[PDB]
Design a protein around this ligand. Structure first.
Ligand SMILES: [K+]
Ligand SMILES: [K+]
Ligand SMILES: [K+]
Ligand SMILES: [Mg+2]
Ligand SMILES: [Mg+2]
Ligand SMILES: [Mg+2]
Ligand SMILES: [Mg+2]
Ligand SMILES: [Mg+2]
Ligand SMILES: [Mg+2]
Ligand SMILES: [Mg+2]
Ligand SMILES: [Mg+2]
Ligand SMILES: [Mg+2]
Ligand SMILES: [Mg+2]
Ligand SMILES: [Mg+2]
Ligand SMILES: [Mg+2]
Ligand SMILES: [Mg+2]
Ligand SMILES: [Mg+2]
Ligand SMILES: [Mg+2]
Ligand SMILES: [Mg+2]
Ligand SMILES: [Mg+2]
Ligand SMILES: [Mg+2]
Ligand SMILES: [Mg+2]
Ligand SMILES: [Mg+2]
Ligand SMILES: [Mg+2]
Ligand SMILES: [Mg+2]
Ligand SMILES: [Mg+2]
Ligand SMILES: [Mg+2]
Ligand SMILES: [Mg+2]
Ligand SMILES: [Mg+2]
Ligand SMILES: [Mg+2]
Ligand SMILES: [Mg+2]
Ligand SMILES: [Mg+2]
Lengths: 98, 129, 149, 139
RNA sequence: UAGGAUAGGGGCCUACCAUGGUGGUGACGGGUGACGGAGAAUUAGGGUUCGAUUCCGGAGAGGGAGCCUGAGAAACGGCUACCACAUCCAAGGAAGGCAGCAGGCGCGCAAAUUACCCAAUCCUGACACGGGGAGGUAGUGACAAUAAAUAACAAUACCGGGUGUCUGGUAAUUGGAAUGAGUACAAUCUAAAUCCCUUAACGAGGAUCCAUUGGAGGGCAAGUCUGGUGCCAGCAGCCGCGGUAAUUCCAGCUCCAAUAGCGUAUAUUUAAGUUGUUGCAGUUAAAAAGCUCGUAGUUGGACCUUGGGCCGGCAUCGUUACUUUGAAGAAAUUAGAGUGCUCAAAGCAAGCCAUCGCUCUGGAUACAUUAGCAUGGGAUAACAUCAUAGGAUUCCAUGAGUAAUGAUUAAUAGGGACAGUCGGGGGCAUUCGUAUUUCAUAGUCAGAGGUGAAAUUCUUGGAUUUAUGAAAGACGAACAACUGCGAAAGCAUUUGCCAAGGAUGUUUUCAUUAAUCAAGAACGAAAGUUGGGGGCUCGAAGACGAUCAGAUACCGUCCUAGUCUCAACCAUAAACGAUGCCGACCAGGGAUCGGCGGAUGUUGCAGGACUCCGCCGGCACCUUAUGAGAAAUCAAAGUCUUUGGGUUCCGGGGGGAGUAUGGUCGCAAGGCUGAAACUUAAAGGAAUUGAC
């Protein structure tokens, strides 16, 4: 019984693809199969930005961002609620949320 | 590779017939294809068809009238005598009332009833009904 | 598709239906014959003679103006090469591959291409033997092949 | 798939000849091992009652099948033969003369009896059926 | 080549000479519970299995060998010898051959009389005449097979259907008639007897002149009747039944099927489209080789007589397959015409006026693969033949003519060339980067590390942390995609070199050169092996800490082989798209990569970037069957009982088992090829409802 048409990965027209290591368990997962996310956040959050504003020496200092591309294996992604288990008909829905 | 142009012609014609098309194109053409089509048209299973000279192998445009149920070749071209025709009739045809088997006898390309009339045998090209 | 690949490309030429040469061609058969003979004297070959005729001298197709193919013209004039062009170029390519592969023993991809080109060479040689276009004693010797070209 | 050339008769014949061997029945018949069985390709056989035994019927059944360990006189092999028709174990005695037959499944165990492929047909030249129905008496 | 020998050819044998002969189109060798054929069984067709036996051919007389006589024998109801048995005997010797008929022993699951006769069919001899265990006749015979009894009718009693009558059915009721099984004069049969056919006399009422074999849960026609047993005895081909109410066991009654036949065991035909040429299968059920090349094999584009109507000679020639017609073709068997053996299975007989006979009475006819011989046909196919004219046609015994002078086209087959490109395709050298570790310098001081929580470990000799710098090895983030290249494995920093490749463009070239492929070859992740180097990180083995009833595991730390590289071996992966390659056709759509054609109007710049349309090639994706499929699902896994485009590999219920052994490659680990005994009624696939 074939759960998915693409087999759970994104490989077509090639035979090999180098792996990566899950950021939580360090498990080798093929690069296309791994659940990849790009998270961009303030260094200090809303409760902190207020207290760091006046503490800044000059008002022209824009607060710096941080960007991180993280990869998760299927087990870690499911356990961390990054991706849930979907229904059989909703599995094919590749549209991102919002 | 293209090992039997007759099979390609008959298969394309049958596929177009099932889809309700009114014309079909056959490429490449050949004399045996023309003779098979002539037999089918004479018995009233197809209509007009014209050969187009492309200076290399020729094409055929055939007009369908909806009367052809199935048509197909037999491979390899088995040799049948006059006494074996009945047996093949019991195999390739729906019933003894109608249907046709095409034989390439040494007197030319004809149907099986004509071969029985002339009392001649030969190889089997195909069938249509 | 391709004999020694998985390609299915169909790019080629399409000769016109009109077999007669076009009206604007005002070159006699003698001029074309002399040009072909001179080119064959200059070490050219039928494939690369036809293109020179097509481009510089405005001859769309030799078989139309002169009524015969380039190879037939050369053979009638006796200037035809001793080896067919396609086999000559296949042998040249195989010789180049062997010369390169001599110094690169770990380049195990040109060895595969060498096997392929040798297979093509042998098939073409067998065909040319069947039609008496090569001596029956002909044989492709890899070591002495480079001396031929 | 298949080779359909008119010149390919040898290929089809050889392929079928090779592939007949996967058949269970054909391989059983044409391997020649049927001659190494105790009956050696015979419908019946004759033997001497070595002893009288009972075998517990296989699960989920629960009974004691009254068999008999006998020895064939044609090759000396020792086989167990079933004794049907309740009370017919009494007719069989020691070192007695019996006619044995197959059980019905052509070299396969029949019923819940573990590993028994023969049944006793005659004893001392008298059929078990005649003794069972009191038509004949043991001599 | 020449002899010898033979009835005769021939290495049949001899002398000399030469090195040949057969083989993946299976030689050689092995097995056969193998005499070959005509034929037998079952058969929609195709087929599968059998063929000791009465007809034909061969071989043998216990096993081998040698030979006489004879026209014919390597004869055995002839001899000689040896081997093995075995027979008398006066112990000096003598005689043997039932796989002839009958009979005996033995072997076995398994097979009849030590009878009569030449009357028939024929054979043999000097012969009309003898003889014939050839052959026929009787005996035993449920091998197989044909026909066919075991009662029919009426009345009465009882009960039904079209108050009534008729019809129809049951009674160890009542009547009569009928007859052969049996017995037997007699005749007939017969070589003589016997059987049959025919027939005096006798011969049926419970017409005792007495029908049996298997079953009664399902498959599968027939009982949820009664009594017994109580997971025992037993039944049960398979599913299953019996544990105090048994429709299944043991019995009675009743009923069912076949019926003078039925049950059981083996072998095998069908069933079996589960051997599949007709006609099966290979994504997930067993089954596409890791991938490509490759000889034999199989398979190979198109093109060349049509209009023409009518309707004894005499040559010398492309070869075949195919198809038609003919001939020759043993009988018996099969199919089949005739024929009233009383019918039938049979037989080849017979039939008729009522004969001193006739129908000339009949004793037909097919089929009989393949191979061989001959006649006609030339569509479809296979071979070589095809442009140095070395071509065709003329003149010059009894050199000049000469002509229409002679070459199919260039596959949306293939190869080669050329042009501008394109790619993380390959080899070599070279360049860069942060991080990790180590070391060096400098700064501060109490913990650091790791964990769900801790400890093993480091540390006031300064651990962890901070900054600078050098060295080493590995690794190439982000860019990175339902994107690219490669035969697959696989391939991701720059630059140079070297050879290769697809696609596109082409009014370039050759002209079938092709597709797939036993044998045979290249390449083939990771781990593994032999040595040299390197040895940062990570880390099988090992050690320690922790958890735990236990922990040789999961969690921590230190680490060996290994991970990197060079020269050689191995040849396997969930080597996967679980989907071999080539070709044609059959829905739509948009996106994307490479090339090309056109339009278009912007760029701090013809061309490049962008937009729009179209063509070819590729990786994919979405919707929908009118398709397919057990379904999941698939635009191919479609064009399949309306079954056939070519070709390779490969599967036959689950285990045993990819095991044993042999062969073969490897240093080894191992790889390729690869069973059997035995065991089992299910194993398995997809989907559904519950439960968890
Ligand atoms: K994914
Ligand atoms: K001779
Ligand atoms: K004589
Ligand atoms: Mg699952
Ligand atoms: Mg690709
Ligand atoms: Mg892979
Ligand atoms: Mg001689
Ligand atoms: Mg000699
Ligand atoms: Mg024998
Ligand atoms: Mg025989
Ligand atoms: Mg006999
Ligand atoms: Mg005989
Ligand atoms: Mg003899
Ligand atoms: Mg004997
Ligand atoms: Mg003898
Ligand atoms: Mg004798
Ligand atoms: Mg004799
Ligand atoms: Mg018997
Ligand atoms: Mg009963
Ligand atoms: Mg019933
Ligand atoms: Mg009861
Ligand atoms: Mg099957
Ligand atoms: Mg499975
Ligand atoms: Mg499978
Ligand atoms: Mg594959
Ligand atoms: Mg053809
Ligand atoms: Mg990078
Ligand atoms: Mg790319
Ligand atoms: Mg191979
Ligand atoms: Mg494998
Ligand atoms: Mg584009
Ligand atoms: Mg199996």
């Amino acid at each position: 019984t074939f759960k998915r048409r693409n087999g759970g990965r994104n490989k077509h027209g090639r035979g090999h693809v180098k792996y990566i290591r899950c950021s939580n368990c360090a498990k080798c997962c093929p690069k296309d199969k791994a659940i990849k996310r790009f998270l961009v956040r303030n260094i200090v959050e809303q409760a902190a930005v207020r207290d760091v504003q006046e503490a800044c020496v000059h008002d022209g200092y824009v607060l710096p961002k941080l960007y991180a591309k993280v990869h998760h294996c299927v087990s870690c992604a499911i356990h961390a609620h990054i991706v849930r288990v979907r229904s059989r008909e909703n599995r094919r829905n590749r549209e991102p949320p919002q | 590779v293209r090992v039997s142009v007759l099979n390609d012609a008959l298969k394309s014609m049958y596929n177009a017939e099932k889809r309700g098309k009114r014309q079909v194109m056959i490429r490449p053409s050949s004399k045996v294809i023309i003779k098979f089509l002539i037999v089918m048209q004479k018995h009233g299973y197809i209509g007009e068809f014209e050969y187009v000279d492309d200076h290399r192998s020729g094409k055929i445009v055939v007009e369908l009238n909806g009367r052809l149920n199935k048509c197909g070749v037999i491979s390899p071209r088995f040799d049948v005598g006059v006494k074996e025709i009945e047996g093949w009739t019991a195999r390739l045809l729906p019933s003894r009332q109608f249907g046709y088997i095409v034989l390439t006898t040494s007197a030319g390309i004809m149907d099986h009833e004509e071969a029985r009339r002339k009392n001649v045998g030969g190889k089997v090209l195909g069938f249509f009904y | 598709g391709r004999m020694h690949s998985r390609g299915k490309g169909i790019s080629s030429s399409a000769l016109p239906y009109k077999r007669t040469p076009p009206s604007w061609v005002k070159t006699a058969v003698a001029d074309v014959d002399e040009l072909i003979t001179k080119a064959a004297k200059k070490g050219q070959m039928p494939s690369q003679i036809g293109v020179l005729l097509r481009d510089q001298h405005g001859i769309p197709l030799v078989k139309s103006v002169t009524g015969s193919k380039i190879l037939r013209i050369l053979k009638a004039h006796g200037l035809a090469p001793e080896i067919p062009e396609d086999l000559y170029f296949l042998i040249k390519k195989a010789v180049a591959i062997r010369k390169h592969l001599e110094r690169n023993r770990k380049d195990k991809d040109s060895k595969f291409r060498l096997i392929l080109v040798e297979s093509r060479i042998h098939r073409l040689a067998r065909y040319y033997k069947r039609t008496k276009k090569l001596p029956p004693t002909w044989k492709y010797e890899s070591t002495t092949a480079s001396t031929l070209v | 798939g298949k080779t359909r050339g008119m010149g390919a008769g040898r290929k089809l014949k050889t392929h079928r000849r090779n592939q007949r061997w996967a058949d269970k029945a054909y391989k059983k018949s044409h391997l020649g091992n049927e001659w190494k069985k105790p009956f050696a390709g015979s419908s019946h056989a004759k033997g001497i009652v070595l002893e009288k035994i009972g075998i517990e019927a296989k699960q989920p059944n629960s009974a004691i099948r009254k068999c008999a360990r006998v020895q064939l006189v044609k090759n000396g092999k020792k086989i167990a033969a079933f004794v049907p028709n309740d009370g017919c174990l009494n007719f069989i005695e020691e070192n007695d003369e019996v006619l044995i037959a197959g059980f019905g499944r052509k070299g396969h165990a029949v019923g819940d009896i573990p590993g028994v492929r023969f049944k006793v047909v005659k004893v001392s030249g008298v059929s078990l059926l005649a003794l069972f129905k009191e038509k004949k008496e043991k001599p």
